[PDB]
Design a protein around this motif. Sequence first.
Motif, PDB file in Angstrom:
ATOM      1  N   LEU C  10      35.260  -0.574 -27.492  1.00  0.00           N
ATOM      2  CA  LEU C  10      35.024   0.499 -26.706  1.00  0.00           C
ATOM      3  C   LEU C  10      35.433   2.019 -27.074  1.00  0.00           C
ATOM      4  O   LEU C  10      36.852   1.870 -27.130  1.00  0.00           O
ATOM      5  N   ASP C  11      35.241   2.725 -27.899  1.00  0.00           N
ATOM      6  CA  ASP C  11      35.140   4.014 -28.175  1.00  0.00           C
ATOM      7  C   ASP C  11      34.726   5.209 -27.152  1.00  0.00           C
ATOM      8  O   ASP C  11      33.801   5.409 -26.996  1.00  0.00           O
ATOM      9  N   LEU C  12      35.735   5.844 -26.363  1.00  0.00           N
ATOM     10  CA  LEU C  12      36.189   6.943 -25.384  1.00  0.00           C
ATOM     11  C   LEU C  12      36.337   7.650 -25.523  1.00  0.00           C
ATOM     12  O   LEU C  12      36.706   8.123 -25.164  1.00  0.00           O
ATOM     13  N   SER C  13      36.680   8.363 -27.116  1.00  0.00           N
ATOM     14  CA  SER C  13      37.397   9.170 -27.368  1.00  0.00           C
ATOM     15  C   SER C  13      37.136  11.085 -27.583  1.00  0.00           C
ATOM     16  O   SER C  13      35.913  10.846 -26.887  1.00  0.00           O
ATOM     17  N   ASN C  14      37.846  11.481 -26.956  1.00  0.00           N
ATOM     18  CA  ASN C  14      37.628  12.883 -26.765  1.00  0.00           C
ATOM     19  C   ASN C  14      36.441  13.175 -25.475  1.00  0.00           C
ATOM     20  O   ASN C  14      35.545  14.216 -25.751  1.00  0.00           O
ATOM     21  N   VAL C  15      36.853  12.440 -24.343  1.00  0.00           N
ATOM     22  CA  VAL C  15      35.147  12.676 -23.302  1.00  0.00           C
ATOM     23  C   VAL C  15      35.823  13.663 -22.707  1.00  0.00           C
ATOM     24  O   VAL C  15      37.412  13.163 -21.806  1.00  0.00           O
ATOM     25  N   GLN C  16      34.583  14.526 -21.847  1.00  0.00           N
ATOM     26  CA  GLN C  16      35.171  15.943 -20.617  1.00  0.00           C
ATOM     27  C   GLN C  16      36.659  16.953 -21.917  1.00  0.00           C
ATOM     28  O   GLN C  16      37.504  16.566 -20.722  1.00  0.00           O
ATOM     29  N   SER C  17      36.660  16.901 -22.776  1.00  0.00           N
ATOM     30  CA  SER C  17      38.235  17.304 -23.895  1.00  0.00           C
ATOM     31  C   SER C  17      37.468  18.955 -24.002  1.00  0.00           C
ATOM     32  O   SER C  17      35.789  19.958 -24.223  1.00  0.00           O
ATOM     33  N   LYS C  18      38.192  19.565 -23.665  1.00  0.00           N
ATOM     34  CA  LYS C  18      37.798  21.719 -22.897  1.00  0.00           C
ATOM     35  C   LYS C  18      38.846  22.011 -24.589  1.00  0.00           C
ATOM     36  O   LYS C  18      39.379  22.051 -24.018  1.00  0.00           O
ATOM     37  N   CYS C  19      37.741  22.224 -25.568  1.00  0.00           N
ATOM     38  CA  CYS C  19      38.234  22.680 -26.768  1.00  0.00           C
ATOM     39  C   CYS C  19      37.503  23.146 -27.584  1.00  0.00           C
ATOM     40  O   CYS C  19      36.843  23.890 -28.925  1.00  0.00           O
ATOM     41  N   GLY C  20      36.763  24.839 -26.315  1.00  0.00           N
ATOM     42  CA  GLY C  20      36.190  25.332 -26.766  1.00  0.00           C
ATOM     43  C   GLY C  20      36.679  26.855 -27.705  1.00  0.00           C
ATOM     44  O   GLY C  20      38.513  26.796 -27.091  1.00  0.00           O
TER      45      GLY C  20
END
Lengths: 115, 115, 115, 115, 115
Positions: C10-20
């Motif tokens: 299962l790939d769930l990388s960068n979930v709910q990540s704030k990088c703006g």
Amino acid sequence: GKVQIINKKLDLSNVQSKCGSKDNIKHVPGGGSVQIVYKPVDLSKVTSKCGSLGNIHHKPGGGQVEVKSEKLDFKDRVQSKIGSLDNITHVPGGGNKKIETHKLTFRENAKAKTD
Amino acid sequence: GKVQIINKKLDLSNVQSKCGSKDNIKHVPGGGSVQIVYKPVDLSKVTSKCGSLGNIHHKPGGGQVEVKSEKLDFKDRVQSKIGSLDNITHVPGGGNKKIETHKLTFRENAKAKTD
Amino acid sequence: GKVQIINKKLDLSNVQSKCGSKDNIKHVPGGGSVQIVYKPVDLSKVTSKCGSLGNIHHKPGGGQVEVKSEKLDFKDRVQSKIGSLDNITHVPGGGNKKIETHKLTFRENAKAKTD
Amino acid sequence: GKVQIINKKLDLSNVQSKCGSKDNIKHVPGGGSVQIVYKPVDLSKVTSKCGSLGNIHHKPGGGQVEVKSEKLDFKDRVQSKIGSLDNITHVPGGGNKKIETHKLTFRENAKAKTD
Amino acid sequence: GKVQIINKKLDLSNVQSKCGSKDNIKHVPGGGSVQIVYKPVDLSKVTSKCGSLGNIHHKPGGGQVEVKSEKLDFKDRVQSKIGSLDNITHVPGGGNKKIETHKLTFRENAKAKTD
């Protein structure tokens, strides 16, 4: 008996992702000036497949913004008098209820009853 | 008996990810100046597959912003008088209820009853 | 009997990540000046596969911002008089309830009852 | 009997990670000056696979910002008089309740009842 | 009987990690000056695999910021008079309740009842 729920190879990338923009761009040169804004958004997908003797050349291009000026001459006086640019008087009020909801659920239920 | 729930190879990358932008860009040269903003966003996916004798050349391009000025001459006086740029008077009030919710659940339930 | 719950790959990388980003860029040269902002965001994925005799060349490009000025001459006086740039009078008030919630749950329940 | 819950090869990197930016950039040269801001964000993934006789060349590029000035001459007087840049009068008040919650749970329950 | 809960090869790196930035950059040269800010963030992952006779060349590039000035001449007087840059009068008040919570739990429960 056999109760099976098989889920495989599901693509759910970039779901409910906010990758937009909101800018307030103002530019008052009063002369010879260049202003460039470069905010591209890329969400594409590329797939290539080959078997045995193969050759894949994946060399996509890119954006290109170029500004050139062979000659530019200014004479006498260059002036720029500014009093104001933005005059905003915002007076809100009252109780504002702002609610946002983002959901993504995967519910699987299996049951087998026998004797 | 056999109760099976098989989940495999699920792609859920970049779900509910905030990677946008919000800028307030102002530029008042009063002369010869260059202002550049470079904020690209890339969320693409690339897949290549080969077997036995193969060759993969993955060399994508990139953004290119170029500004060139062979000659630029200014004469006499260059002036820039500024009193104000932004005049904002914001007077909010009241009780504002701001609620945000982001959810992502994976619920799996299996049960087998027999004699 | 057999009750099985199998989750794999299962790939769930960068979930709910704030990088703006959130910037307030102002630039008032009053002359010959260059201002550059370079904030790229990269969240892409690249996959390559080969078997037996293979060759993978993964050499992607990159962003390139270039500013060139072969000649630039200024004569007489260059002046820049500034009184103010931003005049903000913000007077908020009241009880504001700001609540944010980010959740990510993996609930698995298995049960087998027999005699 | 056999009750099994098998989880393997789960990728949950960079979940609820705050790697953004928030800048207040101001630049008032009053002459010939260069200001550069370099804040790139990289969250990409790269995968390569080969078997037996293989060759992998992983040499990606990088960002490049260059500023060049072959000639720049200033004559007579260069002046820059500044009274103020930012005038802010912020007067908040009241009881503000700010609550943030980030959760990530892995709950697995297995039970087997028999005679 | 056999009740098994097997978890293996889970990647949960950089979860709820705050690696951003928050800067207040101001630059008032009044002449010929260079200001550079270099704050890159790297959270990428790279994987390479080979078997038997192999060769891996992992030489990625890096950021490059260069400023060059072949010639720059100033004549007569260069002046810079500054009274103030930032005038802020912040008068908050009241009881503000700020609560933050970050959680990451792994709960596994196994039970087997028999005669």
